[PDB]
Amino acid sequence: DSLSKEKLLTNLKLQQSLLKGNKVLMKVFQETVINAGLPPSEFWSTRIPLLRAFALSTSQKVGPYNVLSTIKPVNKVNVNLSREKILNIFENYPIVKKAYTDNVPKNFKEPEFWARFFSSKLFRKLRGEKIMQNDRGDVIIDRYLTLDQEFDRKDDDMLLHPVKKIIDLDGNIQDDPVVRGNRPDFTMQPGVDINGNSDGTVDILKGMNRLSEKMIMALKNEYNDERNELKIDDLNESYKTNYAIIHLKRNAHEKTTLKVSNQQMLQQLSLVMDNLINKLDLNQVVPNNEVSNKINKRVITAIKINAKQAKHNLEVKSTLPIDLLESCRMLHTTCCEFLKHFYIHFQSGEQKQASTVKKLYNHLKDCIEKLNELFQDVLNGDGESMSNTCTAYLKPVLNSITLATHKYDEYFNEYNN
């Protein structure tokens, strides 16, 4: 289905679809392929989960439901039609879909059609309403009555299937074919009208049963056992988890990249217990104001250093021209995209990746030179008034990029040379 990497890369229409959904994706994609000419497959190669998420979001569909039962008759009536529910009616009733498609594009209007439909007795029949000759219906819609009837016959023919003997009430009533007793009660048998005909409640009940069967066979779509069926689980062994416990052997390496004696510590301990019981003065704790002044110097130095650390506690406010700010952000973004794709190629590790690595190396070099030329532009646009800040802002991505270039050169010298 539409789930492989090849399928997701193939769906150019879906790619354009979420392209048109976003705006920074036009920005990024335009710079990536319209401006830089990157292979758009490798563009989308990162965004594969996003593509699949968009596809699966677009791909779901609802389950069937009794749309005619949700239809209410609502003096006068005003049509308040919902197109999704109109298509729901179409899907649930292909007869109604057909009656739409041979009359509205031929004879009259859609709201006129639906007014005729709500007027029609075919609507009442298809809904849970007993038909009545007092009702006149709509003649145009009610011409489809026998067509819907033969649809019902064909659908019932489809719905017929053999039954399991474990639950077969037909086999149950065919237990004794020579039962000769008495005629059962009118109460508990299906009653009829005065002239022997039925009222049709059996028809409406078999119709709603047909609706249920159509439901469940819509569920039963494309998208022996009695031994298991008759198991009595209540007298069986309880399930126990096979979860594995874990122990932990403990032997850690010592930290890598004079010794005191009991006599000497005991001597000092005796002496300091003697000093402890001897004396203790709070007043002697006051310092000499000179070594204390050096303490003041050290403390104040630490305060100054950490205060300058705290002095640099939406992005930050900047005094850039907004266009050059956007241009440099754009350049940073496409350089980051290039760098990530180059790392993807490099960490992949194949000889098939070699030309890709070389070409992305060329692109990184081009980005470097374009960064330098941008620095020349902000040079002769500022006189290095705040072109220094431009260079420093674009610095760390450039450092990482050129570090990657050095890594590529080093591995080239490692393998080839």
Binding site: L12, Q16, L19, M26, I34, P40
Partner: peptide, 21 residues
């Protein structure tokens, strides 16, 4: 190949079309 080129040219038109919009 050649048949991929008109697809990507179709995407070229769509990218330009979304630009003015």
């Amino acid at each position: 190949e050649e048949r991929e080129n008109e697809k990507t040219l179709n995407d070229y038109y769509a990218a330009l079309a979304k630009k003015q919009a």
